[PDB]
Paper text:
[name] is a member of the MarR family of bacterial transcriptional regulators. MarR proteins often repress genes involved in the response to organic compounds, environmental stresses, and virulence factors. They are obligate homodimers and many are responsive to ligand binding. Recently, we and others have shown that [name] controls the growth of B. bronchiseptica by repressing genes involved in nicotinic acid (NA) degradation.
To elucidate the structural details of this regulation, we determined the structure of [name] in complex with 6HNA. 6HNA-[name] crystallized in the centered orthorhombic space group (C2221), with 6 chains in the asymmetric unit. The binding pockets are located at the dimer interface between helices α1, α2, α5 of one monomer and α1 of the opposing monomer, and are approximately 8 Å above the recognition helix of the HTH domain. The bound 6HNA is positioned between four amino acid residues extending from the α1 helix on both monomers. Residues Tyr15, His23, and Arg26 from one monomer and His32 from the other monomer each contribute to hydrogen bonding interactions with 6HNA. A comparison of the conformations of these residues shows that the side chain of Tyr15 shifts approximately 2 Å toward the 6HNA when compared to the unbound structure to H-bond with the 6-hydroxy group of the pyridine ring. A superimposition of the 6-HNA bound and apo [name] structures reveals a conformational change within the dimer in which the wHtH motif of one monomer pivots away from the other resulting in a 7.3 Å increase in the distance between the α4 DNA recognition helices.
Author numbering:
A (entry chain A): 12 to 151
B (entry chain D): 13 to 151
Write the structure that this text describes.
């Protein structure tokens, strides 16, 4: 088999690629204005309308705790709203604000630039392949 | 075009890396070793005596985090910190017998983890995923 080299394991490559992409995201959209987590939570609220914590988790693939923290940090900025479930008066329902939608629409071109710079020199087939495989790998 | 975060390469990278980290933690408990500690120990085993620059270049972890991991391991008597006699601003980290024993004990599980991370990819898809993740990091 040969010695074990972590440098050629799929996990090492995943970590390094994710770190590089996070550096690109932070260098293009300043971490001060919006984080990838906050940006994705707001985009989910925009795409699905009013969402509950379970909906935001299942759509955002972020654990309940980090989603709750992001929800607090964004509600403080009047970028999302917290209403009462029209079916469970003891549940939360998160909705998007005009300020939140305005921030999402302001940042979208930068996220597209981030996707393009992250791909780097990959040709179209290689881009489709990497997104296909990263999606296929994230399921049982 | 419309923006879907769900189909952007960053969301997919985050999801894949988080799933692989969950696998790594589900097979190798944090109590024994973290992925960072394991990778630094493997670097010490593969390269011998290393300085902070060598451990960084081999481990792909930022120098400050490498210092933190090295401290957390020297406290556990899994590596040793001897100062080079050819410099005073040079650190020299070496592997201990307990460190090499832990590395050799965990290597089969790290390989099992690499295998579990691959999931249902057929061999061609595996060649492709490692090819693309390596090609994308170089620009
Ligand atoms: O470089 C890393 O952090 C790494 C390397 C191998 C693995 O299985 N998981 C993580
Ligand atoms: O879900 C995330 O963290 C994410 C989503 C999109 C992007 O470009 N980068 C990171």
């Amino acid at each position: 088999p040969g010695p074990y080299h972590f440098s050629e394991q799929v996990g090492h490559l995943l970590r390094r690629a994710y770190q590089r992409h996070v550096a690109i995201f932070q260098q293009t959209i300043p971490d001060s204005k919006l984080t990838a987590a906050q940006f994705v939570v707001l985009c989910a609220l925009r795409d699905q309308g009013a969402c509950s914590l379970v909906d935001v988790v299942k759509a955002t693939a972020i654990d309940q705790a980090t989603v709750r923290g992001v929800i607090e940090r964004l509600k403080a900025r009047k970028l999302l709203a917290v209403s009462h479930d029209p079916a469970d008066r003891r549940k939360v329902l998160v909705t998007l604000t005009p300020d939140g939608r305005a921030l999402v629409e302001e940042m979208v071109p930068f996220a597209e630039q981030i996707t393009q710079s992250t791909f780097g020199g990959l040709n179209p087939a290689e881009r489709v392949a990497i997104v296909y495989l990263l999606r296929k790998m994230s399921d049982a």
